[PDB]
Design a protein around this nucleic acid. Structure first.
Lengths: 121, 211, 154, 147
RNA sequence: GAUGUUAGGAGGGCAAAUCCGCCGAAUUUAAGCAUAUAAUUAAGCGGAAGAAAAGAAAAUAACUAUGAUUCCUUUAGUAACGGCGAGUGAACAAGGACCAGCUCAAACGGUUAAUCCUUCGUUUGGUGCAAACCUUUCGACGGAAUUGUCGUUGAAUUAUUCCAUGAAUGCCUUUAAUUUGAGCAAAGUGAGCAGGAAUGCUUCCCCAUAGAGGGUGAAAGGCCCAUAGUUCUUUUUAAUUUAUUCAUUGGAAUUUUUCAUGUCGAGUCGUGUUCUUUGAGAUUGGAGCACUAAUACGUGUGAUACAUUUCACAUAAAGCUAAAUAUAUGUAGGAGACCGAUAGCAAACAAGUACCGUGAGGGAAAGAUGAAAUAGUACUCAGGAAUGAGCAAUUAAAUAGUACCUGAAAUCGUUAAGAUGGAACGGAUUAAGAGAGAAAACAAGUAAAGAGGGGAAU
RNA sequence: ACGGACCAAGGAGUCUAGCAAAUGUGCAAGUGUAUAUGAUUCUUUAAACAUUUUACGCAUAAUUAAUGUAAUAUGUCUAUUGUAGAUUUGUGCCCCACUUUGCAUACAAUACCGGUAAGCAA
RNA sequence: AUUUCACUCAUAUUAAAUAAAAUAACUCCAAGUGGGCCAUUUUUGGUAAGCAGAACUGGCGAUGAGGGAUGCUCCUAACGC
RNA sequence: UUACCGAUACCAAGCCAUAAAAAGAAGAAAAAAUUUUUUUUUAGAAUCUUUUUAUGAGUAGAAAAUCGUGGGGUUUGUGUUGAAGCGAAAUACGUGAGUUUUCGUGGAACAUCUCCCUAGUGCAGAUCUUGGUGGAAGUAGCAACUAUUCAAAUGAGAACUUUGAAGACUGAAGUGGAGAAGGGUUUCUUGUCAACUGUGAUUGAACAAGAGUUAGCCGCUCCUAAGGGAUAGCU
RNA sequence: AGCACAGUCUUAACGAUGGAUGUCUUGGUUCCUACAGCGAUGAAGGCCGCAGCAAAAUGCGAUACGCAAUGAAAAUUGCAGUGACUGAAUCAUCAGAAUGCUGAAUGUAAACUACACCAAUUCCCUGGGAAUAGUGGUACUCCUACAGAAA
């Protein structure tokens, strides 16, 4: 707003969002975390990863929950374990869910994540 | 052409499209050159960015009465103020070696202007707490406590600004003191008629003086 | 303004008597179906507008300073009439007196929660209600030109 | 402003108000002041009589500052000073106002108008008209020459 | 002088919007056209920068005078130029932006070329992991230079200050500004309705120093990025820890006595002539040719040629210089009462692409399924296959099926009704048919029963 | 006589400079704050606001090639003279004739300014 | 000749008649036009012409309606529904 | 001599507009039922209201008042319970540009007439520009190069693919072998038919996947020619 | 099971052709702001190459759709295969390394992958084994030094 250095142009921001490199896309991957999680980790939002556990709260399956299995930053979608959809050909696929429609419930830790939690701390 | 109009003389018979410019960036650059001088005044460190200029009379008979800011004080003005031109350029005094003081009034209007400006100098030390006496007719310098108590006061800019001139257009006279016998129009006509021969006499004065 | 020579960046070929076609300039050459098409012209496809817009249009106006201060004084005076401010669109049926003056402690506080609280307690709950729901997307091509919303004036 | 233009009100009138037989051609009589003395001659002689020819000497380089000389008439002399002081100046017969019109920007004092009878006034001006001096000194005044 | 497969270096070409030189038109206007105008322009040739060029008076003025250049306002469409026709057209003063001034050319070092460059070694310390870089100076060697570099801008003589150090000792703390990169950053995913899906509608709450924008299955301040606001980091630049001594080593600058009243740009100025240029007119500047100066008491301007002469101003024929100024180029940001795929750049796309011309060159057309193809059509039947159909299938939807948003008109097909003797349509007036239609084209109220909606009653 | 096979979309008195007339607006012998400047204005802000006690333009005076000259004229704050003429005053609050006042304007007459003639001209 | 005072020459139908005579007068700005043609009467040149050139008025142009079968100009008559 | 017919002209009346005029800055009327209810109205906008009279062609041309479009401020609205747009329509309004509604389709935005601001603002034409589509019309036409026939195979399908038989042609200056320029993979094998191969097509110089060009002796490379470029100079 | 003549024209409903209209817009345009050149240390431009499957565009240069380093930070995925359970997968930054043939092009040439001359060159370990027909230099003009010859 008051920062004239950065633009508020519709086309500029849309181009930035739709041609963002994956490093910036992983930050748009961010989603809210539940109330208990927010109390514990003192923050409000975090990006997602292939072994987080999430609860979707918008869309045709706004009640389901589960461990997300894969995220792809090109389509801006995440996929949770048991929201599979049957295709016309007759074999199962995954329903893409926007990260903004879900709330985190749990997080996974690894050799990578044992310092992502430290930086987010 | 037709009807009762002024005969046109528009000078647009060349490729005038290339020579059109519109000043959209008027107030933008006004702001920019405001900020430039604000930055300059912040950077020089409390020394005013203006320079002192002489009060000078405008030439020709159209602007005879007016005065303005001239370029530079003359050598004899600076010397009567007790400054060499070289030592005056360094304390915000403009100098030009082209003007000559053609009048006592011209001299003794700028001399006390120079002295009034000189009555406001406050020098600074140079060598890390080694304040000294100076050189060249510039006033002296002060010490640590003075530099801690002087630099944070209000600067004076009216003296840099062109001297306000109050001229009494309106005035009165005793009626008994008027010269009722004068003939101004006759005096003017006589002067115009007699201009030629007085020029002749001046020429002959010069020829005689060349002896 | 449009580009200076927009639509005129080609070759003027108007071989137009005996060809059984209109005398409009044609694009020369072949191989393209651009070749032989009507060249620059007010009527031709990709030909250039009739009077190309120029940046030296009289964009601004010089208004008399005295007229400007007359207008400002007049608007100030008009703001002091209950009927006029009611007619402009403000919901002021519940506030007490139209030349509304408040104490100087309005400046000393800097939370919009109590700003809105003061506005409501002063009798302008309906005015702020009008303002908050006046917000919506405008119609037309303006909203793809960084002009999305249209909000009422409070 | 385009919606108030006259061409808008003849949008479907074929000739756009320029005639069916005369038509609107481009420069049917020439460009600019082309036809002077030949076919614009009636217009030139009826509206700009002395246009052609030349009269007088040449002043090769002018320097108009040399002859710049604003003028003021005598009847405006008492209008320069404020009303209160003119009020207090008309009572006391022992004093007269000295007005230096050069301060107000006037170089020559002209004689048109009427000065108040038996009201002395002193005028300092660079130049004076004969009638101006006569009017000023007829009411007990004086003209002072300045430069 | 030549010559170096000697040592060390430079130039070449691209790029041009602004900028600097040259060269140089015509279309056009004059209602014809020849001077004039277009235009000191376009094209052509050459040369630089982040700006360039101009610039420190051989300047104005005529005044009580101004004081390098550039640019803005104005002077001013004025003085003036011109088949005095069409047209052309400054300068000074004035108000402002900006504002820094300087050095080569002669004197003296001639009881010491005192100057400059090349090369090769040592070291004064240091920010940097490093790489490299800033500082460092004893030199020595080889040259250049007397056919002139630097010391000197007068010299010497008295009267006060400035500039550096070598060494030793303690010493790199703290505020503002400016600026790069990083994080932090409020409040709902509450009912209910309708939905494929809210961000919609009612309703209950809240945050705002954040109600700019973008994304999210529909219109979101409270879902996400962000936005207010703040917190560190980075370039420097105003204020800010710490100076102490010792010492000669010079240098310089400010002010009294004498000299010496010096020097000051030559095929240059200037003049004649020719051409061009200018508003410059018995010639504004430039150029070619011919002639060819004076020495500051000179010579050059003072807008009409000339002779005699006063006055004023300046000190040509050598050079440098930052600011204000300009930028149809490149790059990077930010915006708009601009255009919305025949528009906007030629190009929203694989666009200067495909394609055409031997070549110089010319130069398009072409965007949209759906929220999701991680839902792009499975299965069956008939067909050689294309395809079609379904009792089968994704979707909210397939008459959204990839020639896919909507899907007009021209033109064509199917069904129905009607008309039809060398045009067809039409105006005006009805009649007969065929479609639709109740908002004036009748029935307010009344009493009963069935479902509700409100207002006044504690 | 020429253009028009049909349909869709596009398609032509506009922009700037300068002048005048008309009308609206502000101020008024003045009027226009030019460039510029300042201000805890600085998404929105390239606009709005403002101008430490003679910048310039136009107007305020004309005329002459031009040295230049320059508008009743000091009898007095009545401010040229007529003929029509709006408004006003009264007498015969509303019809009429007389007086009273005499805007704008029209038609003339007068002075006075600049230039040119003519006479005189130290 | 001018001026000022007196007297007074229908003015209560109007210094003859009539008059949708002030729908007047004047000023400013500006469009289009500046190829015309026809009819009656007159007339020039021509053998004559739907010919060439003029005068008056009215029309066609710019204009339809009823009639002349038909017809830009003839007759009647000019036009809101 | 009568009567009749016969105009957008004449006369009477109504209505529209234009012009002009006369005048104007707050109180109960009626009906239907049965005193009590009900029903309608009960007005006051100065470019306005009421009333009156006269008048109304029109090219070129001028003006006023209106009707629309893109976009901007202001006001205040409609949208998934379906906006814009489009097709057909309407006991709809206007005189008319148009406006407003209905049904269907459409699936995401749209107005503002409260007042004003703005413009790239209104098409039947310009041998107009671009795109699309017609009648002509299943028509002109598919005409040089003497010429084909029988049987079989393949294939969904054979006059123009293959094989065999025949009849013929090119005919010593050849639709024969090698040829340069030009072309650039058209060559070969295999597969194949969406389009092309102006009829068919299973063929093909089309399409797809792979492969194929071997030099001491053949040429270039070397030499010099008509000549070209450059060097030194000189302009 | 039967009935309509045909053609031409008109109207309505539904379709075909076509791509208008509306709504969309990672595009254009204009203005403002700021910085500004590159090249013999080989530029701009042009060719030729580089991916497992790879034509164009984009990116890159024999280290060839990317190496190293730094910040973020674990996938690439159309299949394959490769990756941690952070110098590893991918982004961003980009200073180090590398940067084919040309092109001012500069050894001579040029519709040639032709021809020279001088150091035969380069790699291995810190003086002994190899690659080899295979690397650098050599334009014109000019400047400062230097050189041996000359009248």
């Amino acid at each position: 707003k008051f920062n004239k250095q950065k633009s508020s142009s519709r086309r500029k921001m849309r181009k930035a969002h739709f041609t963002a490199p994956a490093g910036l896309r992983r930050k748009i991957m961010s989603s809210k975390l539940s109330k208990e999680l927010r109390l514990k980790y003192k923050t409000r939002s975090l990006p997602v990863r292939k072994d987080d556990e999430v609860l979707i709260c918008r869309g045709h399956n706004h009640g389901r929950e589960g461990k997300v299995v894969k995220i792809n930053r090109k389509r801006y979608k995440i996929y949770v374990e048991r929201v599979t959809r049957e295709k016309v050909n007759g074999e199962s696929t995954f329903i893409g869910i926007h990260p903004s429609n879900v709330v985190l419930t749990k997080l996974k830790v690894d050799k990578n994540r044992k310092k992502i939690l430290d930086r987010k701390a | 052409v037709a009807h009762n109009n002024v005969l046109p003389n528009v000078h647009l018979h060349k490729w005038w499209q290339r020579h059109v410019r519109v000043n959209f960036s008027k107030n933008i650059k006004k702001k920019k050159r405001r900020l430039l001088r604000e930055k300059r005044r912040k950077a020089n460190g409390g020394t005013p960015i203006e320079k002192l200029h002489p009060i000078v009379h405008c030439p020709t008979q159209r602007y005879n009465f007016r005065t303005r800011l001239g370029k530079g004080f003359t050598f004899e003005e600076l010397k009567g103020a007790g400054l060499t031109p070289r030592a005056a350029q360094t304390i915000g005094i403009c100098y030009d070696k082209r003007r000559k003081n053609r009048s006592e009034e011209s001299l003794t209007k700028n001399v006390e202007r120079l002295l009034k400006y000189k009555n406001s100098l406050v020098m600074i030390p140079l060598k890390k707490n080694k304040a000294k006496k100076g050189i060249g007719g510039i006033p002296a310098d002060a010490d640590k406590n003075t530099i801690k108590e002087f630099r944070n006061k209000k600067p004076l800019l009216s003296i840099f600004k062109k001297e306000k001139n109050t001229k009494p257009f309106y005035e009165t006279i005793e009626v008994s003191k008027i010269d009722k016998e004068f003939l101004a129009y006759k005096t003017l006509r006589r002067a115009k008629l007699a201009e030629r021969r007085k020029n002749r006499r001046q020429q002959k004065k010069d020829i005689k003086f060349k002896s | 303004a449009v580009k200076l020579g927009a639509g005129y960046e080609t070759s003027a070929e108007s071989w137009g008597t005996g060809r059984a076609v209109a005398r409009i300039p044609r694009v020369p050459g072949g191989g393209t179906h651009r070749a032989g098409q009507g060249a620059f012209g007010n009527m031709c496809r990709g030909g250039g507008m009739f009077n190309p817009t120029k940046i030296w249009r009289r964009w601004g106006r010089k208004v008399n300073l005295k007229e400007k201060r007359y207008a400002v004084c007049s608007s100030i005076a008009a703001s002091g009439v209950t009927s006029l401010v009611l007619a402009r669109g403000h919901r002021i049926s519940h506030l007490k007196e139209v030349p509304l003056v408040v104490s100087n402690d309005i400046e000393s506080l800097s939370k919009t929660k109590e700003a809105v609280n003061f506005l409501v307690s002063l009798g302008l709950k309906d005015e702020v209600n009008r303002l908050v729901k006046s917000k919506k997307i405008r119609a037309g091509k303006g909203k793809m030109r960084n002009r999305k919303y249209k909000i009422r004036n409070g | 402003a385009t919606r108030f233009k006259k061409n808008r009100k003849k949008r479907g009138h074929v000739s756009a108000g320029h005639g069916r037989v005369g038509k609107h051609r481009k420069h049917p009589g020439g460009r600019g002041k082309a036809g002077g003395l030949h076919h614009m001659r009636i217009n030139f002689d009826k509206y700009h009589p002395g246009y052609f020819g030349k009269v007088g000497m040449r002043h090769l380089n002018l320097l108009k500052n040399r002859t710049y000389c604003p003028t003021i008439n005598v009847d405006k002399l008492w209008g320069l000073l404020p009303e209160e002081k003119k009020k207090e100046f008309s009572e006391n017969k022992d004093i007269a106002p000295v007005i230096d019109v050069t301060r107000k920007g006037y170089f020559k004092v002209l004689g048109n108008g009427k000065l108040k009878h038996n009201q002395p006034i002193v005028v300092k001006a660079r130049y004076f008209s004969s009638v101006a001096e006569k009017k000023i000194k007829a009411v007990g005044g004086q003209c002072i020459l300045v430069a």
